[PDB]
DNA sequence: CCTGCACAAACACC
DNA sequence: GGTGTTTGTGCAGG
């Protein structure tokens, strides 16, 4: 059995996992797809100083993830792309 | 140096 | 279970 490692989540999911639950408790009738749209709208309204703390914590998650797999590399699946010249 | 694609998680509805 | 939705981060190509 092989255990695959998942990439660290950025400052938006960290913020959205906590903010998503609150929006579901206060808006139990709102669907996640509509909440996602409202969260993106509210997140773009946050100031750099307000987002800084969320940037610092996500970076800690990235370092803690790095401490678990310091030699990890992000390797995305690119689409068969061959451009003629 | 600049631009574009891939990939992460959570919940309601059928 | 699969679908539909969001932003941030990293790597590849020209």
Swiss-Prot record:
It is found in: Nucleus speckle; Cytoplasm; Nucleus. It comes from the Eukaryota. Changing residue 78 to W: Reduces nuclear localization. Strongly reduces nuclear localization. Reduces interaction with KPNB1. Does not reduce interaction with CAML. Does not abolish DNA-binding. The modification N6-acetyllysine is found at residue 81. Residues 5-73 bind DNA. Residues 6-22, 75-81 are annotated as: Required for nuclear localization. Residues 52-84 are annotated as: Sufficient for interaction with EP300. Phosphorylated on serine residues by PKA. Phosphorylation by PKA enhances its DNA-binding activity and stimulates transcription repression. Changing residue 7 to G: Strongly reduces nuclear localization. Strongly reduces nuclear localization. Reduces interaction with KPNB1. Residues 4-81 are annotated as: Sufficient for interaction with KPNB1. Transcriptional regulator that controls a genetic switch in male development. It is necessary and sufficient for initiating male sex determination by directing the development of supporting cell precursors (pre-Sertoli cells) as Sertoli rather than granulosa cells. Involved in different aspects of gene regulation including promoter activation or repression. Binds to the DNA consensus sequence 5'-[AT]AACAA[AT]-3'. SRY HMG box recognizes DNA by partial intercalation in the minor groove and promotes DNA bending. Also involved in pre-mRNA splicing. Interacts with CALM, EP300, HDAC3, KPNB1, ZNF208 isoform KRAB-O, PARP1, SLC9A3R2 and WT1. The interaction with EP300 modulates its DNA-binding activity. The interaction with KPNB1 is sensitive to dissociation by Ran in the GTP-bound form. Interaction with PARP1 impaired its DNA-binding activity. It is linked to 46,XY sex reversal 1: A condition characterized by male-to-female sex reversal in the presence of a normal 46,XY karyotype. Patients manifest rapid and early degeneration of their gonads, which are present in the adult as 'streak gonads', consisting mainly of fibrous tissue and variable amounts of ovarian stroma. As a result these patients do not develop secondary sexual characteristics at puberty. The external genitalia in these subjects are completely female, and Muellerian structures are normal. A 45,X chromosomal aberration involving SRY is found in Turner syndrome, a disease characterized by gonadal dysgenesis with short stature, 'streak gonads', variable abnormalities such as webbing of the neck, cubitus valgus, cardiac defects, low posterior hair line. The phenotype is female. Belongs to the SRY family. DNA binding and bending properties of the HMG domains of human and mouse SRY differ form each other. Human SRY shows more extensive minor groove contacts with DNA and a lower specificity of sequence recognition than mouse SRY. This is Sex-determining region Y protein. It comes from Homo sapiens (Human). The gene is SRY. The chain holds residues 57 to 140 of 204 of the full protein.
